Design a protein around this ligand. Structure first.
Ligand SMILES: Nc1ncnc2c1ncn2[C@@H]1O[C@H](COP(=O)(O)OP(=O)(O)O)[C@@H](O)[C@H]1O
Lengths: 734, 260
């Protein structure tokens, strides 16, 4: 009596029953709306007018008023998720007549003629039947079993009222155990012209597998098999935390688990629950938890837990505050013993979440969703293009790989936005040039994608997870001794952890790279990342410095936690000659605090086995003796200027584009004359020599020796023997 | 908990106002409220649990009436136990924050209630808090909370004992580990607390669920039980939060390692 809102529940007892028009609503509500039992009922689900015209019936006086049942077929057709709010309404005009109907054979190769066996009678024998959406189980179809479903979205009938979402009609068939101009034609999927909300499948998300299988296991073990875990007596966890940069797709995980799960779920509206009355929010939360526990399979979804649950230490806002945190933890600690209940909470930043929620008592299980790497970006672009299809755009694998390589610091949302505004750029180009031609002819190419990266205005530039592009050995021309040394250093831990454990030697976990400001000490990290195939943490020196006091400590602790959590890896520092000096040069107390924290983290009380830390510096004396202590950063590499062979290889690679035979240079006398330079200096010399070659008559097929020698006058090495002697003296004392 | 409640006449002979409040303070996750449950279960006396901010209402006098009633039925029956939890929000520091509304007036009423009619009686109040200085010094007085109980981070021996206890309760039909493995785990778990150890056990069980499913193709867990391989992982992925403490029991080495 006097109803306000309704909730959904699948029709039990399976089989057939009604399967379309169950509608087990309490008779009081039926008499309240003055609706004929032998007439259609309409439920709107808070919006989306059309109100889902479906016939109704009466219950057995046991079904409570709040909950209603409207069949799994309609549940899947309308993308109805168990827990959404539903609102009833008066029925509209009667549906006239159905014209064509046509099956689609979803997720299958069709060819059902052998297994057809007159499915038309079974499909259209049901009462009601709103044509564009039906979905039924495979049931039993002769031999072979298997699972088959069809798509019935396509239609050609016209309806005067545009209010109705799926424009149902009337069915009049003739059969036993005559149609309308057959139904079987083509294997089309859901038609786009109806703009229906399609369900989200796990195939939509790409490049996020490694944690998505873990999340699937963690959400399936409490629900599907609660008794197996409860037999141990430790009880299954109830809280799963999803964290990461914005746009990674936590909302996607929430939506896809809501869609793929046949059990009831409960979602929150966030700030909407917050009200002026202190007790109103408490009562709403208690009612939500009571509803969740009443239905034995339940799942709780929380959006923006940080806003709902801010930190007490950071801000004492008052009113709606950690009181709700205390009541939530009290309710969720002893809501049930075994049950099957899992709570999923997604936060933008984990640090701002109060430590009460971030305790193993409630949210021990955590899921880390970082920014996509090159492989994940390639996977999402390959998946992203598939949705558009080859008809809408001609893109090959090489273009996808090039885009993934170019797009380094881009979030998943940024990629989809780039695709959308690439389509926009295509529309403007077509309208401007072809004078309103069909948009399918121009389709999508790389020309608009280039301008897309040009004007995308990215938002993920500032991050501590910068990964340099993969660079192979052939690019780097250096000394074989240093390469052998670093190969041994990287090969010791990965395939000798057991040997270290048996012997007790462990690993030095510290390598110092000091040398002239030339080359071979920065791109060697990229070469190492390419060769080893292990994720690297390319963290620049000055970027960790922040105006706010303690922000650098937060960043370094977060990066250490990520390195520990991201398997045995290697962390590379671009420069350390700026943070390390505290006594030689005047520095703030923040720098000293950060240095002390780094010293305590590297080998202070806590020793890390899997991770390996390598430090590169441009000036060695800036590292204090506290950091330059035996047991840490013991290895020292001179990594001086490149030798004759290294410079020759660099020059050969630089001149590979040009023609050496036409120029007549043997690539040896140039290296003999270019001995005091560096690899980067050689690259710049070749660049300016090519510029001098091309400024004469635009494009040229070769660079001449006269241009080489003129550029040799033009440029200077800029390196003095005094700094080399100083580096040698430092190497002697080490 | 025994001497005041069970034998109040021994103190009433002295007649010097026996203590009523017992302070249970320490790091979070040390096992406080679960230990309190044991004191409630093993005692046949009445108990009373205060939800804290849930009891707090918008009306100024509603909380006063409800809590005065709570005390009325507490003292109506002679054998009674009083449990107070999350006193930090219940009794914030007056000087730290002058929030108003529900404020130190509640604290003053509690003081004048517990110090008002209790001469000998038989009444005990259990106080549980995370960081003691959040409770105002008025309650942290020999007049109100003279009794202090120190609960801290477990050491090597306590961690070994609790691990042996959890595994013993869990039974050996589900795991195979000897005393030296437990000792090694306790030594490795330098900075963890009992909640962290329970999380380690649960994550080790989960690691088994992941490994057991994805590898042996839905093989029986029994013929799989619990090893240290998954356990060793669990402690890596537990993401410790009990690293930052002033108290630190750094490792031990015998005289054999002493070179001097
Ligand atoms: N052969 C090469 N071709 C192109 N770039 C190079 C080559 N060798 C080195 N570089 C670049 O020059 C940079 C050298 O950095 P470097 O000046 O040593 O750092 P710092 O200023 O801290 O000393 C590296 O980042 C690398 O990318």
């Amino acid at each position: 009596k006097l109803p306000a809102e309704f909730i959904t529940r699948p029709h039990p007892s399976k089989d057939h029953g009604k399967e379309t028009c169950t509608a087990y609503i309490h008779p009081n509500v039926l008499s309240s709306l003055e609706i004929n039992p032998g007439s259609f009922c309409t439920v709107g689900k808070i919006g989306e007018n059309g109100i889902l015209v479906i016939a109704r019936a009466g219950d057995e006086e046991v079904h409570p008023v709040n909950v209603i049942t409207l069949s799994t077929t309609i549940r899947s057709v309308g993308n109805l998720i168990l827990g959404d709010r539903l609102e009833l309404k008066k029925a509209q005009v009667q549906p006239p007549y159905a014209t064509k109907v046509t099956v689609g054979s979803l997720q299958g190769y069709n060819i059902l003629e052998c297994m057809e066996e007159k499915v038309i009678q079974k499909l259209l024998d049901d009462s009601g039947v709103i044509m564009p959406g039906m979905i039924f189980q495979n049931l039993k179809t002769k031999a072979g079993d298997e699972s088959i479903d069809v798509v019935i979205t396509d239609a050609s009938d016209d309806s005067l009222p545009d209010v109705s979402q799926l424009d149902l009609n009337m069915d009049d068939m003739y059969g036993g155990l005559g149609s309308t101009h057959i139904t079987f034609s083509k294997e089309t999927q859901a038609n786009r012209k109806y703009n229906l909300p399609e369900p989200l499948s796990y195939a939509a998300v790409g490049g996020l597998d490694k944690e998505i299988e873990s999340l699937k296991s963690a959400i399936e073990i409490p629900l599907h098999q609660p008794t197996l875990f409860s037999s141990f007596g430790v009880s299954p966890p109830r809280g799963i935390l999803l964290h990461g940069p914005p746009g990674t797709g936590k909302t996607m995980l929430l939506r896809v688990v809501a869609n793929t799960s046949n059990a009831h779920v409960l979602t929150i509206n966030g700030p909407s629950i917050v009200s002026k009355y202190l007790g109103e929010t408490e009562a709403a939360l208690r009612d939500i938890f009571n509803e969740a526990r009443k239905y034995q399979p339940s799942i709780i979804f929380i959006d923006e837990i940080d806003s709902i649950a801010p930190n007490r230490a950071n801000d004492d806002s008052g009113e709606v505050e950690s009181r709700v945190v205390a009541t939530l933890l009290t309710l969720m600690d002893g809501m049930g013993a075994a049950g099957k209940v899992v709570v999923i909470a997604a936060t933008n930043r984990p640090n701002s979440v109060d430590p009460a929620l971030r305790r193993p008592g409630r949210f021990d299980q955590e899921v880390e969703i970082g920014i996509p790497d090159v492989d994940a970006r390639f996977d999402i672009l390959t998946k992203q293009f598939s949705r558009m299809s080859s008809d809408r755009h001609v893109l090959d694998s090489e273009a996808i790989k090039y885009i993934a390589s170019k797009t380094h610091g881009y979030v998943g949302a940024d990629l989809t936005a780039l695709c959308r505004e690439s389509v926009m750029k295509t529309i403007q180009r077509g309208l401007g040039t072809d004078a309103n031609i069909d948009k399918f002819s121009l389709k999508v190419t790389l020309k608009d994608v280039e301008s897309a990266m040009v004007d995308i205005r990215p938002s993920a530039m500032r991050e501590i997870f910068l990964e340099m592009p993969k660079v192979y050995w052939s690019d780097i021309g250096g000394q074989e001794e240093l390469k052998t040394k670093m190969k041994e250093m990287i090969q010791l831990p990965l395939e000798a952890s057991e040997t270290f454990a048996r012997l007790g030697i462990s690993a030095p976990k510290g390598v110092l790279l000091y040398g002239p400001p030339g080359c071979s000490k920065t791109l060697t990290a990229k070469a190492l990342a390419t060769e080893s195939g292990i994720n690297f943490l390319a963290v620049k020196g000055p970027e960790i410095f922040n105006k706010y006091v303690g922000e650098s400590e937060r960043a370094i602790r977060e990066i250490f936690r990520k390195a520990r959590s991201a398997a045995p890896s290697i962390i590379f520092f671009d420069e350390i000659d700026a943070l390390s000096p505290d006594r030689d040069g005047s520095s703030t107390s923040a720098a000293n605090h950060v240095l002390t924290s780094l010293l305590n983290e590297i080998d202070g009380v806590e020793e890390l086995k899997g991770v390996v830390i390598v430090a590169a510096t441009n000036r060695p004396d800036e590292i204090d003796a506290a950091l330059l202590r035996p047991g840490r950063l013991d290895r020292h590499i001179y990594v001086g200027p490149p030798d004759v062979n290294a410079r020759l290889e660099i020059l050969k690679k630089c001149t590979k584009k040009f023609n050496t035979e036409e120029s007549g240079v043997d690539l040896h006398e140039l290296a003999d004359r270019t001995e005091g330079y560096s690899g980067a200096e050689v690259v710049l010399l070749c660049q300016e020599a090519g510029l001098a070659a091309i400024m004469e008559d635009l494009d040229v097929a070769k660079v001449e020796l006269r241009h080489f020698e003129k550029a040799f006058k033009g440029i200077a090495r800029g390196i003095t023997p005094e700094m080399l002697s100083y580096y040698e003296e430092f190497a002697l004392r080490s």
